[PDB]
Ligand SMILES: [Ca+2]
């Protein structure tokens with residue numbers, strides 16, 4: 085909407101106060117004009133028709149319980165935009181400052197979030213498995229990263245390419261979480277998963293097997309559930325990424341860690357220059373090795389560590 089840029093204040097899903105960029109024209113709308121061609125947050129009003137209505141508020145204060153998922157979807161989309169721009173020189177998901185749209189309060193008791201081809205969509209959860217999913221910065225960045233993938237490598241959402249697609253979203257979700265630097269970790273969704281259980285998460289990158297996800301290619305799922313296991317086999321790539329960054333010895337194979345920033349550079353380059361819609365795990369290894377070679381040189385520690393990490397998870 086046409087209006088003037090304003091700054092509202094509210095509380096997110098976890099009860100934390102934050103400022104949000106809004107737009108005033110009769111109402112205050114969740115429309116942030118400070119980033120690209122805008123970040124827009126919508127109310128789906130417990131229904132499934134998308135996007136719903138652009139979020140309107142009378143007073144620019146967002147402290148109602150109903151407001152909390154919108155506050156976080158809007159704010160964390162901004163953080164994710166900043167990460168891609170500041171760290172990777174990428175302007176929004178398409179590289180040309182496409183408007184970023186999110187809807188919250190999608191459906192009833194909805195234990196998921198997704199990119200629908202055009203926008204992000206967040207359930208409120210059922211209060212048992214999830215609380216509103218936009219409360220997790222890693223979740224928001226995971227979803228926006230699906231848009232980045234779709235505009236770049238275009239990894240098909242099934243089997244190995246789909247597991248890479250998933251891992252890319254978990255990797256960048258985590259890197260954005262570290263970028264914001266509030267309780268960062270290598271777990272996925274911990275802030276919004278199972279409010280009645282402390283210390284758990286939906287997935288772990290550092291130890292995927294703690295939730296039954298494979299941490300080695302020999303343990304990959306080959307059935308048809310979950311689009312051929314895209315949220316399961318992602319553990320193999322998540323583990324490799326964790327090892328590249330943090331190091332470790334895994335099934336007897338030692339990896340020298342090179343840190344988060346270099347992990348991000350290597351995987352961003354692989355995603356945007358080398359991966360294709362049909363890339364499999366072996367092709368990801370080759371793309372990561374080539375990316376590290378481009379950035380750091382063939383004889384570099386970074387290249388050696390990429391090879392060690394893929395060796396450790398059984399991907400040649
Ligand atoms: Ca208000």
Ligand SMILES: [Ca+2]
Nearest residue numbers: 267268269274
């Ligand atoms: Ca965390």
Ligand SMILES: [Ca+2]
Nearest residue numbers: 222271272273
């Ligand atoms: Ca996390």
Ligand SMILES: [Ca+2]
Nearest residue numbers: 277278279281
């Ligand atoms: Ca929990």
Ligand SMILES: [Zn+2]
Nearest residue numbers: 226230250253
């Ligand atoms: Zn995903």
